Design a protein around this ligand. Structure first.
Ligand SMILES: [K+]
Ligand SMILES: [K+]
Ligand SMILES: [K+]
Ligand SMILES: [K+]
Ligand SMILES: [Mg+2]
Ligand SMILES: [Mg+2]
Ligand SMILES: [Mg+2]
Ligand SMILES: [Mg+2]
Ligand SMILES: [Mg+2]
Ligand SMILES: [Mg+2]
Ligand SMILES: [Mg+2]
Ligand SMILES: [Mg+2]
Ligand SMILES: [Mg+2]
Ligand SMILES: [Mg+2]
Ligand SMILES: [Mg+2]
Ligand SMILES: [Mg+2]
Ligand SMILES: [Mg+2]
Ligand SMILES: [Mg+2]
Ligand SMILES: [Mg+2]
Ligand SMILES: [Mg+2]
Ligand SMILES: [Mg+2]
Ligand SMILES: [Mg+2]
Ligand SMILES: [Mg+2]
Ligand SMILES: [Mg+2]
Ligand SMILES: [Mg+2]
Lengths: 131, 132, 56, 327, 50, 81, 171, 49, 101
RNA sequence: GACCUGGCGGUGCUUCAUAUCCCUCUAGAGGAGCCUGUUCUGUAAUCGAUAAACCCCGAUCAACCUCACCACCUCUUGCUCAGCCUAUAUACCGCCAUCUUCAGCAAACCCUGAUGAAGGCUACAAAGUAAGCGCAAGUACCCACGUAAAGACGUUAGGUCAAGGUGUAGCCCAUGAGGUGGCAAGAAAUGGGCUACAUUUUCUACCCCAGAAAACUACGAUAGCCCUUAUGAAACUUAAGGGUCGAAGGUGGAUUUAGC
């Protein structure tokens, strides 16, 4: 198949009323659709309980809710690695300091991973959906 | 007298669509089915879960697009895919339609764990089959 | 992730959407196999059928 | 002033299709007709109405039992109802001298036929049926009453009974349709030959839930084999054997043919009735045409439609009702 | 594709069942529903795995 | 681009037009599988096929060389599982 | 249960009880008749009790040439929106409670002497704007039918006149 | 799982994304019963004692 | 949020019956044979009788999933005859039509 | 006082009813036993239907559960941004009965009655035209037949707040929720059905060319009693089988049902 010259890009709804009619509408219509997808994703992650019934066979990992909060509450080096993997710049630093104050040994590799996270983001929280 | 799904004659001023104008004894004669899946075929399984999904989807779409739907939904299932075909009105702004399409497709895909598509057809006004 | 962004473009046609879903694992892989993704721990047939070893 | 709620746009809003609208519908059909040929990969110039129906049936498969509810792509002239043109011009003068009757077409026809009868007086079948009412209304594009239709047909009969000229006969034939009379003549089976060159004729029969296939040989000794078993053994009941004898006895050919039949389904009596039909139809090949007609008039070549009647809910049987209690 | 295919139509299956027509009492009055299953058997022959 | 109509017509009426016609929306159409598309599709799919062994002309030959036959069944239904 | 909820049309049809056995043969009085109220009138798509601002639905998609992000109105800000909504409803309801002064005829509850306005215009661009109509009598006549018994009909006498000599009446 | 369905659609209503015509109907009825005086009493501190 | 308290009691029974299904199956097998000693089979009789009452599968009721009606339910759709007819008569159940013959 | 419309008349004439009104045709019910409803009576112990149009009816179904009943015990923001099988089907939606084994209901106009309630046809025609709905036509099943389906507007404030939803009123330490146990019987009457009273029968073989049986050891219980088994956690109770037992019943009063 080749491109259909009479049709607008496939992403848009193929309907005379909904089809974009300008270069600005083209951009705004996609942005509105992306906003809708973002709102749904926010709800899905805000209330995972509602979307935890897995009925798909084979299992689809991508259609499951995402959990972004650290699930290990113990103050330990192994527990700190989780926060670095989750990219919690503030939690990792606060925990790393607490770990250092307690006096437990932090592996150079773990500290290097913390610097990588801190150096890349400049000690600023990565943009999130909403707080 | 039979009552089931019969819009009753009035003074000749009630507009009815083609689906609303046909009583249940026409469901395989003049009108088709609003849902197509395999659950109700001989030797097929999971008819109960397909029905609960259909009932929910029709309520979800009625409240998600308040006042926009111009007729009943057409639910289509092919393999893993779920296709919702809705005839809507041309009153709500297109921006709001695109937001609701992206929102409903995403929210329903995560709820029923399958790729869901929503195909909207706009009509200027409700299509009147006859006046009862 | 930046290298993925430069090659990123919107879906061009229906086939492309089907391909993306297949790669993401959303759509079923054809021809349909009713045991796709389910393995009973790679158990052999003799493990299921012959259970006398456990009765020792 | 008390404002009476004013009527909206007429709800009934009977749809009228003006001539310009129809002209636009024809252009749409011709353009759509070319796309449909392009879709199916056929020549746009030789795409007929029967190919259009075949293409639409494939592209839009509809199983609806009523064919008038299925997707259709026909010429607007066959879809839209034939509408009468405007009968008066801009000045307002109607175009027909019998306009104010309300039935200018009908009464103009009556006037013409009456005139022809006057001139004829001053000057002096089986296949054809008189045009029915619903079909005459279409010609005239007028709504007629049952009694109006009678009056008109009576005038035509008066015309036909009296001597008519070349022109008068042609006019009458305008209102006569053709009736294709089905022939009640039995269709003979094709006489076949086996490996040994013996003539035989295979046929089929059906009775209730039984179905028999009979092979009647042109020459034989009178041996009948049912499912590979001799007929008296397969049919111990005398009534069943009586039915097997009815076809051959009626044509007076007992002992002159050998039959080999296979019957499955039903009961003993239904099976005997099915074999009787199969044997009678097969035996028609070797009897004369006149004898075949006698077989038909005796009931030996008709499939008995009497089958079991279903049971309906709320009743004890097909017709049996539950005991009724007045009080 | 060069495949040898033969098509035949197996006999259809109609499954019928009855329900009460009214919400309460009126046992004599029933509504009967059916589900029709039609078949078409496509028989390929002499194929390879690919 | 077809003036296709569908719907049982009212008295002195015509089948409903295609716009807003829910009966046409209910049909599983074959507009994507026209004879032109099918022939073009299969032309691209010939590269994936392998050639049946010419030696195994008849079923009797198949039985002689391959005596065992294994029957299995796959079921294609609609749904999430 | 979410699966036991019906639509507004079904809920109002049952609650109003406009079609029943109590409205056939003058079996029910007219005082307790309740009126339908469309509860979707003042509702905006995207407005909820939590006060979230959905870009592209509840609020504009782009602000200052940039796509807005999901936001939530503050507690005090939502209270204002909720309070205003209550006020808007009260005003709309107030409009319906207001009674328009109807010019009475010969008596407060009499139809005699009430103007019906000008006669309706004809189908061929004919107008009767000069003529005035006034009711003279309104009677509830009855006949008896085999199926329903008493069948109520209205007999009305009106008089039309332009005030310049031309006047008529009809039933 | 009637909990998931009922709770999900209740959350979506409070978020402004689902219009529950039924729940709106019983909110107007419950609102008119307060103005009429037919309000639900306090638990424990009821008419009886 | 279930239709009524009766549905809610059946929901708990189906859950408890599932949790004890293996334990009940194992003990019953000891009872449903003539091989094992009667003394051992008598102890099993008491053990399965001491399990919670709501773990007994016979106490489960197939109620309509939409209206909780305990009778007139079609097992294939799990709907009461009144609810099934409402969906079927509106053309919302794939392939189900009125039967006439 | 005189009329309009309808109903009704043991009201006239004429024509008809096709399982149908009568005369006719066939098998039944009303008698016996048993199964299963209902009414009465009984029980601490549901509810609804209950002339035609209730009575193997809501139930394509109750040992616990189901359950809404009774006794006792327990819980109080309660599976639910509560709950209520509490009252009101004479507030309703929803789904239906009934005439219907009908063919009528009709908006919008026009005309008649002196511009009253109302009425509106004559075909060699004299004021009716009529959208729409139903019938019809089409469609399902094996046909164009038949059977299904369909069958309007209305009638019986007909049935159903106990499918679910819901207006009004009532309960909120209880008219709500949970646990354990328990009742669902028969003085009596009666509806529907099942099996019989036998010789066109009983038993066996066979599935229609047989041998026996044939009146106090015959025909006749699917009841009673005993035992076993099936399902279940639970069976004197539900079901199946075997043994034992061998009763009324000898063709049924007034009357009554169904079938082309
Ligand atoms: K009797
Ligand atoms: K009886
Ligand atoms: K209520
Ligand atoms: K109990
Ligand atoms: Mg009926
Ligand atoms: Mg019979
Ligand atoms: Mg006053
Ligand atoms: Mg049970
Ligand atoms: Mg008796
Ligand atoms: Mg009772
Ligand atoms: Mg009662
Ligand atoms: Mg019972
Ligand atoms: Mg109990
Ligand atoms: Mg209670
Ligand atoms: Mg009533
Ligand atoms: Mg017919
Ligand atoms: Mg019928
Ligand atoms: Mg009909
Ligand atoms: Mg009543
Ligand atoms: Mg009652
Ligand atoms: Mg209580
Ligand atoms: Mg016997
Ligand atoms: Mg016994
Ligand atoms: Mg046991
Ligand atoms: Mg004896």
């Amino acid at each position: 198949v080749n491109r259909d010259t009479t049709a607008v890009p496939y992403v848009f709804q193929d309907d005379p009323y909904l089809m974009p009619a300008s270069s600005l509408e083209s951009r705004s219509f996609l942005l509105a659709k992306k906003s809708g997808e973002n709102v749904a994703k926010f709800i899905i992650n805000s209330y995972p309980k509602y979307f935890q019934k897995d009925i798909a066979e084979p299992h689809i990992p991508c259609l499951m809710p995402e959990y972004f909060e650290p699930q290990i509450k113990d103050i330990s080096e192994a527990a700190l690695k989780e926060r670095i993997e989750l990219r919690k710049v503030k939690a990792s630093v606060d925990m790393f300091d607490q770990l250092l104050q307690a006096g437990t040994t932090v592996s150079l590799e773990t500290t290097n991973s913390l610097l990588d996270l801190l150096c890349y983001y400049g000690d600023q929280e990565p943009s999130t959906d909403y707080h | 007298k039979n009552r089931a799904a019969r819009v009753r004659v009035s003074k000749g001023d009630k507009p009815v669509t083609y689906e609303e104008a046909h009583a249940p004894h026409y469901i395989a004669h003049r009108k088709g089915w609003l849902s197509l899946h395999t659950g109700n075929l001989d030797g097929e399984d999971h008819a109960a879960e397909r029905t609960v999904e259909d009932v929910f989807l029709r309520k979800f779409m009625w409240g998600t697009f308040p006042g926009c739907l111009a007729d009943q939904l057409v639910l289509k299932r092919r393999g893993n895919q779920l296709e919702i075909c809705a005839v809507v009105l041309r009153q709500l702004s297109p921006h709001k339609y695109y937001f609701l399409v992206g929102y409903s497709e995403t929210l329903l895909s995560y709820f029923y764990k399958c790729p869901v598509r929503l195909h909207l057809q706009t009509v200027p006004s409700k299509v009147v089959y006859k006046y009862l | 992730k930046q290298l993925a962004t430069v090659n990123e473009q919107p879906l061009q046609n229906g086939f492309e959407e089907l391909i993306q879903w297949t790669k993401e694992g959303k759509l079923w892989e054809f021809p349909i196999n009713n045991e796709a993704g389910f393995d009973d721990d790679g158990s052999e047939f003799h493990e299921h059928i012959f259970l006398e070893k456990h009765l020792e | 002033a008390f404002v009476i709620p004013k009527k909206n746009v007429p709800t009934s809003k009977r749809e009228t299709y003006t001539e310009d609208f129809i002209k636009k519908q024809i252009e749409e059909f011709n353009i759509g007709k070319r796309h449909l040929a392009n879709m199916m990969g056929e020549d746009p110039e030789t795409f007929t109405q029967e190919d259009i129906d075949r293409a639409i049936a494939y592209l839009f498969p509809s199983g609806l039992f009523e064919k008038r509810a299925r997707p259709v792509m026909k010429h607007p002239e066959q879809i839209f109802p034939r509408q009468r043109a405007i009968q008066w011009g801009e000045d307002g003068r109607p175009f027909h001298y019998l306009f104010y009757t309300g039935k200018q077409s009908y009464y103009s026809l009556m006037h013409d036929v009456y005139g022809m009868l006057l001139n004829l007086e001053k000057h002096q079948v089986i296949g054809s049926r008189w045009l029915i009412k619903e079909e005459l209304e279409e010609m005239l594009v007028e709504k007629l009453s049952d009694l109006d239709y009678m009056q008109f047909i009576r005038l035509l009969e008066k015309l036909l009974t009296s001597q008519c000229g070349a022109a008068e006969e042609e006019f009458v034939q305008r209102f006569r349709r053709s009736v294709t009379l089905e022939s009640k003549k039995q269709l003979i089976e094709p006489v076949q030959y086996d490996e040994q060159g013996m003539a035989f004729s295979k046929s089929e029969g059906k009775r209730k839930t039984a179905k028999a296939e009979a092979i009647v040989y042109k020459h034989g000794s009178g041996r009948i084999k049912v499912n590979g078993i001799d007929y008296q053994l397969y049919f111990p009941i005398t009534q069943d054997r009586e039915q097997l004898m009815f076809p051959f006895h009626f044509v007076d050919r007992l002992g002159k043919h050998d039959v080999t039949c296979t019957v499955s389904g039903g009961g003993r009596s239904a099976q005997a009735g099915a074999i009787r039909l199969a044997m009678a139809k097969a035996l028609c090949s070797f009897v004369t045409e006149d004898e075949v007609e006698w077989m038909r008039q005796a009931g030996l070549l008709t499939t008995d439609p009497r089958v079991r009647e279903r049971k309906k809910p709320g009743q004890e049987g097909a017709r049996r009702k539950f005991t009724w209690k007045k009080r | 594709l060069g495949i040898s295919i033969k098509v035949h139509e197996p006999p259809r299956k109609i499954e019928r069942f009855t329900l009460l027509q009214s919400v309460h009492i009126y046992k004599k009055h029933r509504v009967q529903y059916e589900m029709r299953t039609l078949y078409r058997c496509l028989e390929l022959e002499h194929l390879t795995g690919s | 681009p077809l003036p296709v109509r569908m719907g049982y017509p009212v008295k002195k009426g015509v089948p409903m037009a295609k716009e807003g016609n829910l009966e046409l929306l209910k049909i599983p159409n074959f507009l994507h599988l026209t004879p032109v598309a099918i022939k073009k599709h299969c032309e691209a799919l010939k590269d994936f096929c392998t050639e049946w062994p010419a030696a195994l002309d008849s079923d009797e030959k198949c039985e002689k060389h391959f005596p065992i036959e294994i029957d299995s069944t796959d079921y294609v239904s609609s749904g999430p599982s | 249960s979410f699966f036991t909820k019906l639509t507004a049309d079904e809920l109002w049809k049952g609650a109003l009880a406009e079609t029943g056995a109590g409205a056939k043969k003058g079996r029910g009085k007219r005082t307790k008749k309740k009126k339908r109220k469309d509860l979707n009138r003042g509702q905006i798509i995207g407005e909820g009790r939590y006060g979230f601002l959905w870009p592209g639905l509840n609020v504009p998609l782009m602000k200052n040439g940039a796509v807005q992000t999901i936001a939530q109105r503050s507690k005090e800000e939502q209270e204002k929106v909720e309070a205003d909504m209550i006020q808007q409803r009260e005003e709309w309801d107030r409009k319906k409670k207001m009674k328009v002064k109807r010019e009475r005829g010969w008596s407060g509850n009499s139809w005699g002497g009430i103007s019906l306005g000008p006669p309706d215009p004809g189908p061929c661009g004919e107008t009767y704007e000069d003529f005035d109509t006034r009711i003279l009598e309104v009677r509830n006549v009855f006949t008896m039918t085999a199926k329903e018994g008493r069948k109520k009909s209205i007999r009305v006498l009106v008089a039309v006149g332009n005030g310049k000599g031309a006047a008529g009446f009809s039933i | 799982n009637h909990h998931t369905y009922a709770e999900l659609m209740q959350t979506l209503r409070f978020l402004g994304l689902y219009r529950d015509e039924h729940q709106d109907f019983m909110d107007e009825q419950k609102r008119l019963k307060k103005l009429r005086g037919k309000e639900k009493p306090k638990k424990g501190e009821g008419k009886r004692a | 949020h279930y239709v009524d308290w009766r549905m809610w009691r059946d929901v708990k029974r189906r859950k408890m019956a599932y949790e004890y299904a293996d334990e009940r199956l194992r003990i019953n097998s000891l009872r449903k044979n003539t091989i094992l000693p009667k003394i051992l089979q008598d102890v099993a009789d008491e053990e399965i009788a001491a399990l919670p009452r709501d773990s007994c599968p016979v106490r489960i009721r197939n109620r309509c999933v939409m209206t909780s009606r305990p009778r007139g339910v079609k097992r294939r759709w799990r709907l009461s005859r009144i609810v099934f007819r409402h969906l079927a008569d509106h053309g919302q159940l794939s392939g189900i039509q009125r039967a006439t013959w």
